[PDB]
């Protein structure tokens, strides 16, 4: 019915979905891989968006981050990896995304997540935020904590894909 | 291919908050069932029949949504319905903790079922069924928070 209407996204059934999953991914962990695997199972396309210039100086640069993720996520056909240096809503808009994946680890974060969701609704109304709990197995891990365990020689082989574990050991002499 | 999501709840009764959640879910998944708990441990104002009838009318305009009672383990219901997603609205910090527990249990009971969480719109971020009832019970104006059909049925219950 194209000559009458192009269509609306609401009240008219299911629509093509394209999700961004933004983060610093410094580096990508198995907790991250789990989230995006889950989101890629239920949305048509997912983009792992890696922040170029995070406020705190990352251990891996963008080019390293992007490469490690690419490799770690290549077995998922509907996932692509991109760096970005914008608001997550502007990137979403540029990418013609309509879904924003957010991992939801801690109670302490829930307020902030809600507030950021409200900001994003104001910024890009047609962008929907969707929240995924982490697996029980990855509930206590973070990039930051894996890096600090690793610096002081703790075993983190369980928490990382192999390519990342190797890059990480190299960073730490 | 197909996504089919369950949105379970007591829905005693369905509010504008719930309607926002399911409108949003039904825009992202091919089909959505509103799943209404038959026998909540606290006895509801509206019985299952009424809760279902109300919710059906409020959601009639959504072509890929269907309202159903259920009185079994949600794992079994999702499995009976060939659902592969579970939708939860997430209003409060208090409710996050509990839903994260139920989610881990659901992962044990049904690995293939993915739990998914939406935040309420700002508009509806403070309303619950319980609160609308409380306010209405002492004659407060709650017309902004319910669809007409539910509004009239609530007024009737309180008279």
Swiss-Prot record, chain A:
Binding residues annotated for ATP, in chain numbering: 24-25, 32, 103-105, 113, 138-144
Organism of this sequence: Enterobacter sp. (strain 638)
Highest taxon in the source lineage: Bacteria
Biological role: Reversibly transfers an adenylyl group from ATP to 4'-phosphopantetheine, yielding dephospho-CoA (dPCoA) and pyrophosphate.
UniProtKB keywords: ATP-binding, Coenzyme A biosynthesis, Cytoplasm, Magnesium, Nucleotide-binding, Nucleotidyltransferase, Transferase
UniProt-annotated binding residues for substrate: 24, 56, 88, 102
Pfam families linked: CTP_transf_like (PF01467)
Entry keyword Cell wall biogenesis/degradation: no
Keyword Transferase: yes
Listed GO CC annotations: cytoplasm
Cell location: Cytoplasm
Family: Belongs to the bacterial CoaD family.
Protein's name in the database: Phosphopantetheine adenylyltransferase
EC number(s) given by UniProt: 2.7.7.3
UniProtKB/Swiss-Prot annotation, chain B:
Biological role stated in the UniProt entry: Reversibly transfers an adenylyl group from ATP to 4'-phosphopantetheine, yielding dephospho-CoA (dPCoA) and pyrophosphate.
Protein's GO biological process: coenzyme A biosynthetic process
Organism: Enterobacter sp. (strain 638)
Record-listed substrate binding positions: 10, 42, 74, 88
GO MF annotation terms: ATP binding; pantetheine-phosphate adenylyltransferase activity
InterPro entries assigned: Cyt_trans-like, PPAT, Rossmann-like_a/b/a_fold
Name assigned to this protein: Phosphopantetheine adenylyltransferase
Subcellular location: Cytoplasm
Keywords: ATP-binding, Coenzyme A biosynthesis, Cytoplasm, Magnesium, Nucleotide-binding, Nucleotidyltransferase, Transferase
Cofactor(s) this protein cannot do without: Mg(2+)
Binding site for ATP: 10-11, 18, 89-91, 99, 124-130
One term under GO cellular component: cytoplasm
Pfam families: CTP_transf_like (PF01467)
TM spans (from-to): none
Record has Nucleotide-binding as a keyword: yes
Catalytic activity: (R)-4'-phosphopantetheine + ATP + H(+) = 3'-dephospho-CoA + diphosphate
Involved pathway(s): Cofactor biosynthesis; coenzyme A biosynthesis; CoA from (R)-pantothenate: step 4/5
EC number(s) on file: 2.7.7.3
Site feature (Transition state stabilizer) residues: 18
Family membership: Belongs to the bacterial CoaD family.
UniProt subunit comment: Homohexamer.
């Amino acid at each position: 019915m194209a000559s009458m209407t192009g269509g609306q996204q609401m009240g008219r059934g299911s629509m093509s979905t394209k999700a961004i999953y933004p983060g610093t991914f410094d580096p990508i962990t198995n907790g991250h891989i789990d989230i995006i695997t889950r989101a890629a199972s239920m949305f048509d396309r997912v983009i792992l968006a890696i922040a170029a210039s995070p406020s705190k100086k990352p251990m891996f640069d963008l080019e390293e981050r992007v490469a490690l993720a690419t490799t770690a996520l290549q077995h998922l056909p509907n996932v692509e990896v991109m760096g970005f240096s914008d608001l997550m809503a502007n990137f979403a808009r540029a990418q013609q995304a309509n879904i924003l994946i957010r991992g939801l680890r801690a109670v302490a974060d829930f307020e902030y997540e809600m507030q950021l969701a409200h900001m994003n609704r104001h910024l890009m109304p047609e962008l929907e935020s969707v929240f995924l709990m982490p697996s029980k197995e990855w509930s206590f891990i973070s990039s930051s904590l894996v890096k600090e365990v690793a610096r002081h020689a703790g075993d983190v082989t369980h928490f990382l894909p192999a390519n990342v574990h190797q890059a990480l050991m190299e960073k730490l002499k």
